[PDB]
Amino acid sequence: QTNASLVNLRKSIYLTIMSSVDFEECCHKLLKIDLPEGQEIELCNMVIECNSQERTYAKFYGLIGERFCKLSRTWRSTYEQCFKNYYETIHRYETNRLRNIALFFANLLSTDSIGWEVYDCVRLTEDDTTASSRIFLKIMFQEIVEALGLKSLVERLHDPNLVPYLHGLFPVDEARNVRFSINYFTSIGLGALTEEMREYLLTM
Amino acid sequence: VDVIQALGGVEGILEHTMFKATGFPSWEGLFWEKASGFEESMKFKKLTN
Amino acid sequence: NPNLLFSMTGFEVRILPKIRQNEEFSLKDGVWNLTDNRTKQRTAQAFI
Amino acid sequence: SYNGIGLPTPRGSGTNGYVMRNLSHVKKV
Amino acid sequence: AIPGGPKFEPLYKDEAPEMEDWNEFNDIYKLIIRHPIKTEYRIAFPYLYNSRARSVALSEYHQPSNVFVPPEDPDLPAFFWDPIINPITSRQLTLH
Amino acid sequence: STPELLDLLVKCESKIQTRVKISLNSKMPSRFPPAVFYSPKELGGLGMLSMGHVLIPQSDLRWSKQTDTGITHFRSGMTTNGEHLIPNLYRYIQPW
Amino acid sequence: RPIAHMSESVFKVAVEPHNPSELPKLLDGLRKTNKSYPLSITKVEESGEHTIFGTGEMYMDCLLYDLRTLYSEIEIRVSDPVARFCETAVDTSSIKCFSDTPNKKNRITMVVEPLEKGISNDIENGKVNINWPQKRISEFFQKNYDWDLLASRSIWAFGPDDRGTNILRDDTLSTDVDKNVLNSVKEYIKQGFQWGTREGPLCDETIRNVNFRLMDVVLAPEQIYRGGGQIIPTARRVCYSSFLTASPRLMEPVYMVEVHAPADSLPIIYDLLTRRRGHVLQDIPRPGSPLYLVRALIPVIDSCGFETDLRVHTQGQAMCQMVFDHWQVVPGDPLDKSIKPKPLEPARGSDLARDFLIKTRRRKGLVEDVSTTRYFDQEMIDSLKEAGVVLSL
Numbered sequence A: 001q002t003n004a005s006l007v008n009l010r011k012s013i014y015l016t017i018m019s020s021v022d023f024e025e026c027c028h029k030l031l032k033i034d035l036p037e038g039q040e041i042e043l044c045n046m047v048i049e050c051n052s053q054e055r056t057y058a059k060f061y062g063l064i065g066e067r068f069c070k071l072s073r074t075w076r077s078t079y080e081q082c083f084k085n086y087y088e089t090i091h092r093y094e095t096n097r098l099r100n101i102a103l104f105f106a107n108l109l110s111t112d113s114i115g116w117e118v119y120d121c122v123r124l125t126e127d128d129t130t131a132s133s134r135i136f137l138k139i140m141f142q143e144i145v146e147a148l149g150l151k152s153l154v155e156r157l158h159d160p161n162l163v164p165y166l167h168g169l170f171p172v173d174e175a176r177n178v179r180f181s182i183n184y185f186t187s188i189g190l191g192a193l194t195e196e197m198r199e200y201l202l203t204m
Numbered sequence B: 001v002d003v004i005q006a007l008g009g010v011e012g013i014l015e016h017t018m019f020k021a022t023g024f025p026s027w028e029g030l031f032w033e034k035a036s037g038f039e040e041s042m043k044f045k046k047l048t049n
Numbered sequence C: 001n002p003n004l005l006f007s008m009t010g011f012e013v014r015i016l017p018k019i020r021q022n023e024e025f026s027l028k029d030g031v032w033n034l035t036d037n038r039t040k041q042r043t044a045q046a047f048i
Numbered sequence D: 001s002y003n004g005i006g007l008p009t010p011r012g013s014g015t016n017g018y019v020m021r022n023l024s025h026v027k028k029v
Numbered sequence E: 001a002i003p004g005g006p007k008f009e010p011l012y013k014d015e016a017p018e019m020e021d022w023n024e025f026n027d028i029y030k031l032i033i034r035h036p037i038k039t040e041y042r043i044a045f046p047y048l049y050n051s052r053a054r055s056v057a058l059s060e061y062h063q064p065s066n067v068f069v070p071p072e073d074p075d076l077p078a079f080f081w082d083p084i085i086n087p088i089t090s091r092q093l094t095l096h
Numbered sequence F: 001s002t003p004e005l006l007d008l009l010v011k012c013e014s015k016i017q018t019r020v021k022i023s024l025n026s027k028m029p030s031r032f033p034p035a036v037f038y039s040p041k042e043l044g045g046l047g048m049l050s051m052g053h054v055l056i057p058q059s060d061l062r063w064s065k066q067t068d069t070g071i072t073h074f075r076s077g078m079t080t081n082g083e084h085l086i087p088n089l090y091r092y093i094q095p096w
Numbered sequence G: 001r002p003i004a005h006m007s008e009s010v011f012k013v014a015v016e017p018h019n020p021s022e023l024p025k026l027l028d029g030l031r032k033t034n035k036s037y038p039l040s041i042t043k044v045e046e047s048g049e050h051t052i053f054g055t056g057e058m059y060m061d062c063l064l065y066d067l068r069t070l071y072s073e074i075e076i077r078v079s080d081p082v083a084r085f086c087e088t089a090v091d092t093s094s095i096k097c098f099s100d101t102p103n104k105k106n107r108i109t110m111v112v113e114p115l116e117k118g119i120s121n122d123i124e125n126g127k128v129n130i131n132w133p134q135k136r137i138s139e140f141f142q143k144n145y146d147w148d149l150l151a152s153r154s155i156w157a158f159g160p161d162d163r164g165t166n167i168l169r170d171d172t173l174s175t176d177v178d179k180n181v182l183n184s185v186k187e188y189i190k191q192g193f194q195w196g197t198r199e200g201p202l203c204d205e206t207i208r209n210v211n212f213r214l215m216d217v218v219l220a221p222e223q224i225y226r227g228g229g230q231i232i233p234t235a236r237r238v239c240y241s242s243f244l245t246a247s248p249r250l251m252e253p254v255y256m257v258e259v260h261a262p263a264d265s266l267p268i269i270y271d272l273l274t275r276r277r278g279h280v281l282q283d284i285p286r287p288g289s290p291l292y293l294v295r296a297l298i299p300v301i302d303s304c305g306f307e308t309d310l311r312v313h314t315q316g317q318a319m320c321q322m323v324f325d326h327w328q329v330v331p332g333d334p335l336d337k338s339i340k341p342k343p344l345e346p347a348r349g350s351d352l353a354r355d356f357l358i359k360t361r362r363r364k365g366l367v368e369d370v371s372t373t374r375y376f377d378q379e380m381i382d383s384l385k386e387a388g389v390v391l392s393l
Helices: A002-018 A023-032 A040-053 A059-071 A074-088 A095-110 A116-121 A131-148 A152-158 A177-188 A192-203 B002-006 B009-014 E039-044 F003-023 F034-038 G020-036 G057-071 G117-125 G134-145 G149-153 G179-198 G228-245 G263-275 G306-313 G352-364 G378-387
Strands: C004-008 C011-017 C031-036 C041-047 D019-021 F056-058 F073-075 G012-017 G041-044 G050-053 G076-078 G086-089 G097-100 G107-114 G155-159 G166-170 G210-218 G248-261 G279-285 G292-299 G322-329
Touching: A002 A023, A002 A040, A002 B002, A023 A059, A040 A059, A040 A074, A040 A095, A059 A074, A059 A095, A074 A095, A074 A116, A095 A131, A131 A152, A131 A177, A131 C041, A152 A192, A177 A192, B002 B009, E039 G306, F003 F056, G012 G020, G012 G057, G020 G041, G020 G050, G020 G057, G057 G076, G086 G107, G097 G228, G107 G228, G117 G134, G134 G149, G134 G155, G155 G179, G166 G179, G179 G210, G179 G228, G210 G228, G248 G263, G248 G352, G263 G279, G263 G292, G263 G306, G292 G322
Parallel strands: G166 G210
Antiparallel strands: C004 C011, C011 C041, C031 C041, D019 F073, F056 F073, G012 G050, G012 G076, G041 G050, G086 G248, G097 G107, G107 G210, G155 G166, G248 G292, G248 G322, G279 G292
16 A cells, blocks of 8 residues: 555645745655655655756755755765666656756755765766766756855865765776766866876876 | 645545535536626616615 | 845845855845856855 | 744734744854 | 743733834843843743833742642551651761 | 745735635634635636745744844744645746 | 851843933932842943842842832843853963053062962951961961962962952062062052952953962162052053963852752753753752752853743752852853854853953953053063964963
């Protein structure tokens, strides 16, 4: 009977989101909704889906996600897993929904809400990337540059000093992947951060 | 559609109304008539207050 | 005083540059982020 | 009417008062 | 309004900004914040924890605590040492 | 972002409903569940758009006039008898 | 003899009339209040606001009831209650500190250090008296604190006034022919020391637990140039400068609660005490009664409405009584510009002192800058540059 219970819970979450004015009130009402112990992924997934289904990205949903992942630690882990899942399943979303999801996750990352551990799931190699993933990344990084200023971004990328190591973003020195990384990161508009790897091609 | 879902669906809304007394088989086909024709007859005639 | 205030049409606008903020607030839906074309980065927030 | 929260009387507004806690407030030689 | 008690009408609606000034008295600039002043304080000590204190009423401060516990079973004598009472042992004293 | 306009919206929507209640010579709340007012026109309702059915944020009044404090409490808006979540109109309008 | 009361005030409240048109009646009301309450201390600050000092919150409640209703039937605006602070020194003076008389020839230098633990309490309880033959004081100090001979004989005065917790000592190296000159200038350097230690340089407040041991006094000409009024400001200024160089701290008064609650009310009391920066000295069953006795300390500044919370959360039981107990040092460092507190939240340790100091200075109307260079001369600033510790001052 979990199909009907899950559908009813999803409907209640959607109605609660749509009957809210500001993100604080929506979070308070969502916290009032009781839910089974292991399905905390469902609330985050429907928050992201509702964000995607709307015409233009409104900071409402980014603020909702940021507040939940700042409320506790389980929500932050849930959101990192949500990003991990949504990256692999991004080829099946149209351009507008992809843009909305990219804005959501970019607002989450730009405020240090989920931590940049998520970037260990990225990899810029043709064997596991598509056009949709490329556009997803460009939108995320453009928003993050705009929000932070491209000044602090190069420190945030240059000093991982944790389990993030950018082994797909900054590819391990092998094959043609470094060329892909460099020309994509200069095509997007970033350019500066790739100068550090620009010397590797000289080295090898 | 959202406010239809919020109130409990079309069936949930119609349980409040007198739809059942009409004896109509299903709600899908029905439609409302805005003016009774008698009203349209007297929309220009001079009438007391 | 750090913030410009004005009222255009029916709106009351308050512009607070990032230099003079020294305070952390949630970027509401009703807060407009103003950018700078010279640096292509947000420099002030307008409260509407 | 209590700790600075609430309206002086519910009469005159379309509400009944009934303030609730935020339940999402982030308490940090 | 204490959250378990009644709610009335203000009885004093004169709080408009006719002075139009903050009086530079209650401003954050010159005030030490340690703990918020709850309304329980404003009701317990009406003349200290709030200005504009008119028509308030004062209540009995304290009463001597009652130490009578009714007997559980009539078979016991009326005068009997209740085990709840702590024993009278105070060998911590320096007398003459 | 304007907390005064929100309570004005609640008040004015409530009085718009009160006009309909008065016209039938009874303004009892049991007689008029939200399905009477907010159900679409083709279902026999009034088809009223709703925004007074939301929580109005509150913060301590002592420091509300002198600083922007965090939203610590929520005062209910127009009450729906039972568990009903009438959708907000603003959620179907994209911000400027 | 003036009455020796059993407690201090250490509880400050600022008042003002609702409309300044009725300022004089409040003044008369305050005068009458000062007449009727012995520990009430009505004071006027530079800002023009009037402060009142009372023993506790019930004391101030009754005092303000009488002020409003009994004496001056007007309406007043009462500020939030605040504790009465004090300043002290925790470390020895970094550098020698000297000052110059307006005649620019008589030079006087001082150094300072904290007292030993017992001296404060022994002075306060009357184990000492300045109106004693010097042999008794010398022997008392020698036996009880292993103090040395000449130092024990060199006790000049206690500040401020008798029963004060400051010691004017002098170590002039002996070998001074001008003993008559020294005894001439002593009688009005005493007054300067009392004035300086009564009105602190850190804030307009008394100083506790500090000895001002005089180092060197130089004055060549005859007694004509030795004016008492010419030398008192020099003594006050040098005392201030020495105290500032000693890395001062802030002392606050602490109560000592005594709660009588049943067993099941014990955890709540502990929570309140841990919440209000307090700790339990003793928690034992009460002999002969079914109640439990809790004895604890709690700072005055954090004791606002503790009794009300205790009696509300305990369903009417657990009555408490607060007695002023002693003074404790505030953990923070008062003079630390590196700390910028956000003006909404309470300080959270190691920054309490700076917050208290700046807020008190603003309340009293004193300038926030605290010019350290105001209290010592430019040559002293050069000496600080030589010593390398001029960055703090």
